[PDB]
Amino acid sequence: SSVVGLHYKIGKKIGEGSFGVIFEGTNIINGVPVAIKFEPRKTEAPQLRDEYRTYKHLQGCDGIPNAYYFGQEGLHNILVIDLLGPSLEDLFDWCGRRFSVKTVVQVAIQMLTLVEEVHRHDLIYRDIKPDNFLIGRRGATDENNVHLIDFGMAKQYRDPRTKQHIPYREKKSLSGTARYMSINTHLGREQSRRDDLEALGHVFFYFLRGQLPWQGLKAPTNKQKYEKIGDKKRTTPAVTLCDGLPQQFAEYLDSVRSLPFDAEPPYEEYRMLLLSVLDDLGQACDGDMDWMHLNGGRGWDATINK
Numbered sequence: 001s002s003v004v005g006l007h008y009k010i011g012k013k014i015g016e017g018s019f020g021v022i023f024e025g026t027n028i029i030n031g032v033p034v035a036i037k038f039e040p041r042k043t044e045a046p047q048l049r050d051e052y053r054t055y056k057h058l059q060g061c062d063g064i065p066n067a068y069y070f071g072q073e074g075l076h077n078i079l080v081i082d083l084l085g086p087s088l089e090d091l092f093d094w095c096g097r098r099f100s101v102k103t104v105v106q107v108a109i110q111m112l113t114l115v116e117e118v119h120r121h122d123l124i125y126r127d128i129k130p131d132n133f134l135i136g137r138r139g140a141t142d143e144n145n146v147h148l149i150d151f152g153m154a155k156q157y158r159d160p161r162t163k164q165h166i167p168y169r170e171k172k173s174l175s176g177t178a179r180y181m182s183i184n185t186h187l188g189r190e191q192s193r194r195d196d197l198e199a200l201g202h203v204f205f206y207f208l209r210g211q212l213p214w215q216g217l218k219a220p221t222n223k224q225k226y227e228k229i230g231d232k233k234r235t236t237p238a239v240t241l242c243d244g245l246p247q248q249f250a251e252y253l254d255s256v257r258s259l260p261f262d263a264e265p266p267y268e269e270y271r272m273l274l275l276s277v278l279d280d281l282g283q284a285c286d287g288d289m290d291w292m293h294l295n296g297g298r299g300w301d302a303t304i305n306k
């Protein structure tokens with residue numbers, strides 16, 4: 001059948017997110033474009049239904065798309081959400097694998113706000129990477145704002161009613177993306193709010209430099225590769241990552257790395273820290289982004305870029 005969930009016509013496949021089977025589509029009642037993620041209906045570790053509830057739990061938060069349907073349709077499981085634009089990894093590539101300091105600050109404060117409101121709903125994200133932060137669609141209100149998708153790695157970190165934190169714990173299996181994950185993750189420690197923020201600091205330097213110094217390491221196995229990346233993260237001072245860059249990014253990474261395990265990070269203080277970079281450089285926080293100058297001032301386009 002060309003239509004799932006009663007109302008959603010399946011369209012072009014876009015197969016992001018685990019190669020994890022995503023299509024674009026349209027709501028046949030109101031023309032609203034949607035993203036449709038299928039998932040094999042029987043699985044050991046099915047994430048689609050708790051991902052649906054995660055979107056509902058975060059419903060109304062800015063930068064988090066609506067979920068309109070989760071259901072059946074025979075062979076798979078379906079989740080329908082708002083359709084968004086390219087990822088920050090995509091735009092990073094099209095901009096030459098380098099973001100200006102201005103673009104990094106502006107995207108950083110929106111990412112900090114996104115993660116904060118995930119944390120405010122008693123969840124840690126635990127899969128921070130530029131591939132899961134998406135901009136909006138062209139000619140939309142939110143075309144160039146950052147959004148957050150894919151909550152398959154999310155976990156409750158405090159009880160919602162009592163607000164009491166999960167116990168600290170160790171010897172957890174290392175999974176996530178090794179390029180960005182916190183040092184604590186490398187050591188098998190239970191993740192918490194600070195670890196989402198340390199991962200963000202890694203992305204910030206990734207954007208600013210074009211590369212992180214623990215990229216391109218090799219080992220016989222994956223486990224040993226993860227260990228070498230973790231070793232590099234701990235012998236590279238934040239001040240050397242930020243050689244030639246505004247020192248507020250080194251102070252950011254240093255401070256979130258030293259946060260206590262259950263501590264509530266000072267999100268607004270971190271945002272003011274990064275905002276001060278623009279003041280030291282005489283720039284304004286006006287929403288102008290590097291990718292908005294792509295292709296003569298038209299921005300990203302499918303024929304030329306991807």
Ligand SMILES: Cc1ccc2c(-c3ccncc3)c(-c3ccc(F)cc3)nn2c1
Binds near residue numbers: 134
């Ligand atoms: C790496 C990556 C990139 C984009 C993207 C979409 C995405 C792409 C474009 N517009 C909206 C979403 C989603 C997605 C997740 C869950 C779902 F139910 C539907 C879509 N995952 N995902 C994962």
